[PDB]
Design a protein around this ligand. Structure first.
Ligand SMILES: O=S(=O)(N[C@H](c1ccccc1)c1cc2ccccc2o1)c1ccc2c(c1)OCCCO2
Ligand SMILES: O=P(O)(O)OC[C@@H](O)[C@@H](O)[C@H](O)[C@@H](O)CO
Length: 585
């Protein structure tokens, strides 16, 4: 019947109690799974939220058990990392005509960007010409914008890759997709494989290839799964690589900006730095050079979450200011400013939040007086301002800007990174009562700009900010168990996540979930055979423009009622979250 093909890949909803014996659950990609540790995230207080997320984050470093998924520390992964270092090196030895591309959509593209800069700094620092570039879905503007719609075109990925790959002779394309999901990346990998004289593709993500997306890509003939399966075959001859450890599910189901983004840095910085230090030593990269770096990153989780109580506090003050319709500001210097801005933007699509609700600033790029004159005026008793810097920063810029803000608001808080035995100028010190200071041991660093110190701090800040922004919103009751029910459908992945969530929370059939979703999307238009047969992009484009789509679909199912009825029931309830919560009961 119409819509049969569009929806063929969808698994049937399991009967009550057999979620598993169906094999529905064994098919849920790890990156889409519910994390058992957070099944009551919607009840944890600030302190537990920090603990549960710090624990989810810990799973990146957890080793493989004995019939189960390879992980970061597994020998198959580390060995692939070695052989990939190997190949970066070949390009490091012939810079002329050589290029290294790091590419993803959304947070994967964001991660790509940071790391491209870093490794270009390192090559510059040695007086060599920078060989790194990034690519992000929607172009460069996406790096600091919520633009969830642009990951959906394979042609567009291939375009940008063709652009940047100019008249280069040797090109390493590291396609980064956490879910092994983004059509943007799928197209690049496939293009690399049709020209391995020039291209070497390395696919990075955190699902088994058996769980990679297998739904049709609208501008492309093969699926992500097929693309990845073919890369895996080429790996035996070292012409493609698939680097895909399991890190376990996200604490907020499907929120791959968290662990997936963190693991992406951890994995690739490790690997790239190894390749660099070892080319200079004229020695092959080895599992042992990778491990040193991996273990430093693992200390970095420990170090970072040593400050949990102060993390939970800042969480409370972020959450308060948002429950009172105030705003939260994130002010930080160099690369940590950038990470600040990434976190705030991501709250827009992740939580349905205003750009002003949690916003980031670099000293978006608003310098000292500029920020003092324009942003500083608009503050308020209930707002929160957050300062994020190292002690190698312009601490005279810092204390000034804090001085002004202190009058306009008292809920200030800071996150400061020091090597041991650096001290905080006593003015600054007096301005913060419980400060989140994170002090790092000394480590022997090979290069000019201490790139290993940079990676530790960026990562630790990411964890802190992610855990804060995410927990702030959970506290406001806006998450259901460990799902964001009320998301904006802005791409095909998110369409599938909505449909899966409808099956999960209603328990009702596939066909009914699909119908209720399309009805809620296209209302006031009824279901026609055209709509049923439409490509998924048509549904996304209409759904993107609307509110409460998923809650309305779910009410419809729960009350076995029409869209008209569900909408009017929603409007006659204190809140979305109450309407849904009470219908589920
Ligand atoms: O397009 S799919 O091949 N893959 C997506 C996916 C794969 C890899 C990374 C992210 C997302 C997906 C597959 C999938 C299977 C079970 C439950 C949720 C699911 O989400 C797909 C496969 C099966 C699906 C489904 C979608 O829609 C939701 C309901 C379950 O049936
Ligand atoms: O890396 P993927 O699986 O291809 O995901 C790419 C993007 O959808 C993803 O990063 C999204 O922007 C984030 O909001 C997920 O929290």
């Amino acid at each position: 019947m119409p819509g049969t093909k569009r929806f063929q890949h969808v698994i049937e909803t399991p009967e009550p109690g057999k979620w598993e014996l169906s094999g529905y659950e064994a098919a849920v990609p790890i990156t889409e799974k519910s994390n058992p540790l957070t099944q009551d995230l919607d009840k944890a207080d600030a302190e537990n939220i920090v603990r549960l997320l710090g624990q989810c984050d810990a799973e990146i470093f957890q080793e493989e058990g004995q019939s189960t998924y390879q992980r970061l520390y597994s020998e198959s992964i580390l060995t692939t990392m070695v052989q990939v270092a190997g190949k970066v090196q070949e390009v490091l030895k012939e810079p002329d005509g050589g290029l290294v591309v790091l590419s993803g959509g959304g947070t994967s593209g964001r991660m790509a960007f940071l790391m491209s800069v870093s490794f270009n700094q390192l090559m510059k620092g040695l007086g060599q010409k920078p060989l790194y570039t990034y690519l992000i879905a929607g172009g460069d503007r996406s790096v600091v914008a919520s633009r969830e719609g642009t990951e959906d075109s394979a042609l567009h990925g291939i375009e940008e890759l063709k652009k940047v790959a100019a008249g280069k002779k040797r090109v390493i394309v590291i396609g980064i997709s956490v879910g092994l999901s983004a059509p943007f990346v799928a197209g690049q990998m496939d293009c690399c494989m049709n020209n391995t004289a020039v291209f070497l593709p390395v696919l990075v993500g955190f699902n088994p290839v058996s769980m990679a997306r297998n739904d049709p890509i609208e501008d492309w003939s093969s699926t992500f799964r097929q693309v990845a399966e073919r890369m895996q075959k080429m790996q035996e001859k070292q012409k493609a690589f698939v680097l895909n450890p399991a890190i376990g599910p996200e604490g907020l189901s499907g929120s791959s900006r968290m662990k997936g983004g963190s693991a992406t840095k951890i994995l690739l910085e490790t690997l790239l730095l190894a390749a660099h230090k070892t080319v200079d030593q004229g020695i092959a990269a080895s599992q042992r050079c990778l491990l040193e770096i991996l273990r430093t990153f693992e200390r970095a989780h420990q170090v970072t979450y040593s400050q949990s109580p102060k993390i939970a506090t800042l969480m409370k003050s972020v959450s308060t200011s948002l429950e009172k319709k105030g705003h939260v500001y994130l002010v930080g210097w160099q690369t940590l400013g950038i990470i600040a801005i990434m976190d705030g933007v991501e709250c827009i699509h992740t939580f349905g939040a205003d750009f002003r609700d949690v916003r980031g600033f670099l000293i978006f790029t608003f310098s000292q007086e500029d920020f003092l004159t324009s942003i500083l005026p608009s503050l308020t008793e209930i707002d929160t301002v957050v300062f994020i810097f190292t002690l190698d920063d312009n601490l005279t810029e810092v204390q000034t800007i804090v001085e002004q803000v202190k009058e306009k608001t008292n809920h200030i808080q800071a996150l400061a990174h020091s090597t041991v035995g650096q001290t905080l100028p006593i003015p600054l010190k007096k301005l913060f009562p419980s400060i989140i200071s994170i002090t790092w041991p000394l480590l022997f660093f090979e290069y000019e700009g201490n790139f290993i110190q940079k990676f530790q701090r960026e990562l630790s800040t990411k964890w802190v900010l992610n855990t804060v922004s995410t927990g702030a919103h959970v506290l406001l009751g806006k998450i259901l168990q460990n799902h964001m029910l009320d998301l904006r459908i802005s791409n095909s992945k998110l369409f599938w996540r909505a449909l899966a969530m409808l099956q999960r929370f209603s328990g009702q059939s596939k066909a009914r979930c699909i119908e209720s979703l399309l009805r809620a999307i296209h209302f006031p238009q009824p279901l026609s055979d055209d709509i049923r047969a439409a490509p998924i992009s048509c549904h996304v484009q209409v759904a993107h423009e609307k509110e409460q789509v998923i809650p309305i679909a779910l009410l419809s199912l729960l009350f076995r009622c029409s869209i008209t009825e569900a909408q009017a029931h929603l409007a006659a309830a204190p809140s979305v979250c109450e309407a849904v919560r009470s219908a589920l009961a």
